[PDB]
Amino acid sequence: GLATILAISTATPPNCVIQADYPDYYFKITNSEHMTELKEKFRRLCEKSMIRKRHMCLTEEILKANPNMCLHMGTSLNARQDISLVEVPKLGKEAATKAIKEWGQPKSKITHLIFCTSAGVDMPGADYQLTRLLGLSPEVKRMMIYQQGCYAGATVLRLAKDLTENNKGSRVLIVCSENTVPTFRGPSDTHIDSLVGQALFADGAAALIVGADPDASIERPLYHIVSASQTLLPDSDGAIEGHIREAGLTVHLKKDVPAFFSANIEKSLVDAFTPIGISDWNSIFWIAHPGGPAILDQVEEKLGLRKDKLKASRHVMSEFGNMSSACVLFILDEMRKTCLEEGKATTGEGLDWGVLFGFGPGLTVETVVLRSVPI
Amino acid sequence: GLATILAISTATPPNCVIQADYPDYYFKITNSEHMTELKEKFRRLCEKSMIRKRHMCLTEEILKANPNMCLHMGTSLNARQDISLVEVPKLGKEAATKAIKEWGQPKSKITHLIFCTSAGVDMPGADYQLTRLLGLSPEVKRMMIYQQGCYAGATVLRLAKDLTENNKGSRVLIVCSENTVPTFRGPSDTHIDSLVGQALFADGAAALIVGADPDASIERPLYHIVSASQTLLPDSDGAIEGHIREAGLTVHLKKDVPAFFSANIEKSLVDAFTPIGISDWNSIFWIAHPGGPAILDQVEEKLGLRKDKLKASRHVMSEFGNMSSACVLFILDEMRKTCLEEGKATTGEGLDWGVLFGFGPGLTVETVVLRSVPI
C-alpha cells in the first residue's frame, strides 16, 4: 500500500513576539533607532507579511550575551552554532514526543528517522542527537537532510514515501526543526533582502509518523502520500541563495521570486495530476508553503483559486510565520484538526485529492500529491 | 529486483602530494619547522598511515593567497567556502560524466540524483550545481546528503536502494565529492587529533548509476545491493566529532575509536548475514572504509580475517588517502576492474556475497550486503 501519515504534531519555543511590536523591538535590540527611514521600511515589511506572531528561541537576554549577532555582518557563526546546535534537536524532541504519543505505539517500533534542518550543521548531526534524546533503537536507519531550506517539508515526505513503501513493517519518524539563530542580524540599508528575512523567519518544529499498510486496529491514517515530484524553474538561477559564512547564514534574493513560482506552478500541477485525471485546481485541497506571501497571492490569482483554498496555509503563516520546512507540516496538522472540528467528510476539507507544495532555493518546486482520509 | 550498480567512475584533482615528502612540505608551508617534536609525531602518523600519495586541490599557491588557512584556528571559513563550494561540483561533474559514459544511456534517463559531500554547505546545494553543470532534466528528483562524514559512501547506497526499488524505471546518479579545503590548517601543540586529519584526508569524487531491473541488452550490472543497515555503537558517544566553525571544519578524535569499531563489528555482520545463511567472514568479499587504518587492522585481527580480505580496501587508501565518502566507491570500482582483468568468476573477487562498511561519527556503522555479478 501507499505511504500513510499516521500522526502529526508540532512544537514552538515558548517565547512569542507580536508582529505589531517587532519593528520597535528589533530596531531597539540592534541599536538601530536612528535609522528612521529603514525602520519604517521594515515596519511595512512586517505589516505586509500578514504574520500576527512568531515564536523565537532568541531572547533579548541571549542577544545581549552574543552582541556580534546584532551587527549586520559580525563574526558570529561560532556563537550561533553554540546556541542552535542544542536547540534544534531539543525543539525537535518536543514535537517528536507528541507525535509518538498520538501514534500510540512504542518508540521501539520506529525503524527510520528523517531529520531536517537548515539551522546549523554538525558531525554527528541532529539526527544522532534526536536518536539519543528520544531513546530510539540504535539500529534506527537515519537520513539527515541538512540546509535544503523552505521546500524540505515536502522533500521529507518524498523521502519517507520510498523508505516506508520499500521496507515492509517500516515506521518512519520525520522531524523538521527550524529557528532564526543563524539568520538573525542587524539591519543595513544595502541589504534589504536580509531585512525581508528578519520580518518573516520564525522558530518551529513538526514531527510525523509515516508508514505503509496501517494496522486499522491500532493506527489511524490522516493522509496518503500518492506521489512526490521535484523540479527546477527555468531561468531562475540565483533567485534565492543562502550562504553559510563567518557571520552566519546570509540570505540573498533577486527581484521577482513570486513571478517565477506563479508563472511555473501550473506545469507542476499538470505533471502531478494528469495521471489522476484531475485538471480543476479548485477540486483538490491545498497545502502551500506560505513563507513568501506574495507567492501565494500571485499563484492564487494566476490559477483563479477560490479565495479560501489557501486559508489553512495562510493561517499557519499568520499564527507562526515562516518556519521554513516545518510550515507545510504545521498546515497539514491544522487542516486535519479543523476538518474534524467542522464535521467535514474528509481530512482534506471534504475533498478526496490534494496538493502539497514546497518552494525554495534553486528555485525548486516540490509537488506532493495527497489523498484525504474519510471523516 | 534488487537495486543494481550499473556504472562506476572516479576523479581526483591533478595535484598530487607524495606522502614520503609530506611532513617536510607541510611543516615548511605552515612555517612551523621549529616545532621539532610535533613534526616527529607527524612523521610517525604519515608513515604509519601506509598512504603513498594523495590528491589535493589545495596548492601552495592557493595557500599563499589564503594565509589564514595556514594558521591553526585563523578566521578562515569564508575563504574555505569560496574555494570548496566551486570545487565540489566541479570534481563531482568530472566523475559523473565518466560514469554516465560507461553506462552508455542518455542522461535524460536519469530520474534521481544523490549528492554527498562534507566539504561545504550552500543554498542551493551541490546537487543543484551538478544538475546545471551536467544539464540533467530539471525534473530530476534530488537528495542532498551533507556533512555525514566517512560512512556516507554506504549511506548513499542505502538511500539509492529504496529510491530505485520503489520506482520502476528509475535511474539514480550518485556523486560523492570530498576534499581537504575545510580541514587543512597549521599544527598546534595542544590539538594533535587535528594532525591525524592532516596525515590522512585527501580529495576525490566517485559517481555511480544505480537502478533496479536492468535491461540486459544495454546495461551491465556490477553489484546488487541486497540490504543496508545502520547502527550506533554502545557507549561511543563523542568519540568522533566534527564542528563547522569560523576556523573551518575542526576534527576531534579519541584514541579508542578503532577499539569501538572492532569490538562491535561482528554484531553488524551477524545481523546482516544471518538472513543469508553465512557465518564465515572470510567467505564474503570485503569493502571497508579504510580511512582509519587502525580500524581495519583491529577488525581484521578481531574477526580473524585472512590478510588478503582487505587488500582492495587498503590499496585505495595507499594510492589516494582518506577521501571520506568516496573511498568505498573507489574500492568497488577497483575490485570489479581487478576481477575482470584477472579473469575471476565474479566482480566480488570470485565470491558471491559481500559486505560494504562505512564508519564515521556517532560512532555509526553502515553495513551494506552486496551480491557480485558473474564475469
Interface touch A123/B123, C-beta < 8 Å: no
| Interface A-B: count of C-beta contacts within 8 A | 149
| A17, three cell numbers | 513576539
- Domain identity same for A154 and A257: no
Give yes or no: A116 in active site: no
Alpha carbon of B361: minimum distance to chain A alpha carbons (Å): 5
Q: What is the 3-state secondary structure (H, E, C) of B28-78?
A: HHCCCCCCHHHHHHHHHHHHHCCCCEEECCCCHHHHHHCHHHCCCCCCCHH
Interface touch B232/A131, C-beta < 8 Å: yes
**Looking at chain B, which residue has its C-alpha nearest residue A115?**
B145
| CA distances to A58, A309, B101, B137 from B5, in Å | 47, 45, 14, 21
What is the C-alpha to C-alpha distance for residues A13 and A321, in angstroms, rounded to an integer? Answer: 13
Which of B69, B75, B112, B123 to mutate: most A Cβ within 10 Å?
A: B123
- Check the annotation: does B348 bind a ligand: no
**Positive/negative CA dihedral, B344, B286, B367, B336:** negative
| B149, three cell numbers | 562524514
- Domain identity same for B215 and B248: no
Alpha carbon of B108: minimum distance to chain A alpha carbons (Å): 14
Which of A69, A110, A162, A230 to mutate: most B Cβ within 10 Å?
A: A162
Interface touch A123/B118, C-beta < 8 Å: yes
Give yes or no for a contact between B300 and B334, defined as CB atoms under 8 angstroms apart: no
Give yes or no for a contact between A361 and A346, defined as CB atoms under 8 angstroms apart: no
Nearest to A272 by CA among A365, A150, A133, A189: A365
Name chain B contacts of A123, Cβ cutoff 8 Å.
Answer: 118, 147-149, 240-243, 360-361
- Check the annotation: does A294 bind a ligand: yes
Residue written as cell 479548485? A282
Q: Which residues pair with A339 in a beta bridge?
A: none
Residue at which a domain ends, from A221, A244, A262? A221
- Domain identity same for B189 and B258: no
Nearest to A313 by CA among A298, A329, A337, A325: A329
What is the C-alpha to C-alpha distance for residues A170 and B161, in angstroms, rounded to an integer? Answer: 15
Query: Using CA atoms in the order A115, A249, A52, A10, what is the torsion angle rounded to 10 degrees?
Result: 10
**Looking at chain A, which residue has its C-alpha nearest residue B234?**
A138
**Positive/negative CA dihedral, A303, A306, A310, A314:** positive
What is the C-alpha to C-alpha distance for residues B307 and B282, in angstroms, rounded to an integer? Answer: 10
Write out the residue range of the structural domain in which residue B367 sits. Answer: 222-375
Name chain A contacts of B240, Cβ cutoff 8 Å.
Answer: 123-124
Helix runs in chain B, H state only: 22-29, 36-48, 60-65, 77-103, 126-134, 152-165, 193-200, 257-273, 293-303, 311-320, 326-341
Give yes or no for a contact between A48 and A293, defined as CB atoms under 8 angstroms apart: yes
Say how many CA atoms lie within 13 Å of A287 toward its Cβ: 33
- Domain identity same for A249 and A298: yes
- Domain identity same for A300 and A353: yes
Give yes or no for a contact between A55 and A16, defined as CB atoms under 8 angstroms apart: yes
Residue written as cell 506571501? A293
| A18, three cell numbers | 507580536
What is the C-alpha to C-alpha distance for residues B147 and B256, in angstroms, rounded to an integer? Answer: 23
- Domain identity same for A180 and A287: no
- Domain identity same for B198 and B316: no
**Looking at chain B, which residue has its C-alpha nearest residue A248?**
B246
What is the C-alpha to C-alpha distance for residues B336 and B344, in angstroms, rounded to an integer? Answer: 9
Interface touch A122/B243, C-beta < 8 Å: yes
Interface touch A162/B158, C-beta < 8 Å: no
| Chain gaps in chain A, named by the residue before each (C–N > 2.5 Å) | none
Residue at which a domain ends, from A171, A195, A221? A221
Alpha carbon of B123: minimum distance to chain A alpha carbons (Å): 5
- Domain identity same for B142 and B51: yes
What is the C-alpha to C-alpha distance for residues B147 and B152, in angstroms, rounded to an integer? Answer: 9
**Looking at chain B, which residue has its C-alpha nearest residue A130?**
B362
- Domain identity same for B227 and B211: no
The one catalytic residue among A116, A150, A327, A339: A150
* Resolution value in angstroms: 2.0
Residue written as cell 540573498? A252
How far from chain centre, in Å, is Cα B260? Answer: 20
What is the C-alpha to C-alpha distance for residues A250 and A141, in angstroms, rounded to an integer? Answer: 32
Interface touch B139/A364, C-beta < 8 Å: no
Which H or E run contains B223? strand B223-232
Burial of B168 (0-12, 13-18, 19+ CB in 10 A): exposed
- Domain identity same for A17 and A106: yes
Residue at which a domain ends, from A221, A250, A274? A221
Q: Which residues pair with B209 in a beta bridge?
A: B7, B173
Alpha carbon of A16: minimum distance to chain B alpha carbons (Å): 28
Report the structure determination method.
X-ray
DSSP string over B313-343: HHHHHHHH-B-TTHHHHHHHHHHHHHHHHTT
Interface touch B75/A78, C-beta < 8 Å: no
Alpha carbon of A138: minimum distance to chain B alpha carbons (Å): 5
- Closest residue to B142, CB basis, from A118, A230, A241: A230
Eight-state DSSP code of residue B220: -
CA-based end-to-end distance of chain A = 20
How far from chain centre, in Å, is Cα B87? Answer: 16
What is the C-alpha to C-alpha distance for residues A148 and A155, in angstroms, rounded to an integer? Answer: 9
Interface touch B81/A245, C-beta < 8 Å: yes
The SS3 assignment for A30 reads: coil
The SS3 assignment for A369 reads: strand
| CA distances to A167, A211, A228, A292 from A162, in Å | 8, 10, 10, 29
Amino acid occupying residue A40: E
Name chain B contacts of A163, Cβ cutoff 8 Å.
Answer: 162
- Domain identity same for A90 and A173: yes
Nearest to A10 by CA among A69, A55, A52: A55
- Domain identity same for A243 and A138: no
What is the C-alpha to C-alpha distance for residues A77 and A65, in angstroms, rounded to an integer? Answer: 14
Structural domains of chain A, count: 2
**Positive/negative CA dihedral, B277, B280, B281, B285:** negative
Give yes or no for a contact between A187 and A38, defined as CB atoms under 8 angstroms apart: yes
- Check the annotation: does A41 bind a ligand: yes
| A284, three cell numbers | 483538490
Say how many CA atoms lie within 13 Å of B44 toward its Cβ: 7
Interface touch A243/B271, C-beta < 8 Å: no
**Looking at chain B, which residue has its C-alpha nearest residue A365?**
B139
Interface touch A232/B123, C-beta < 8 Å: no
Active site residues of B: 150
Helices then strands, each counted (H, E), chain A: 11, 14
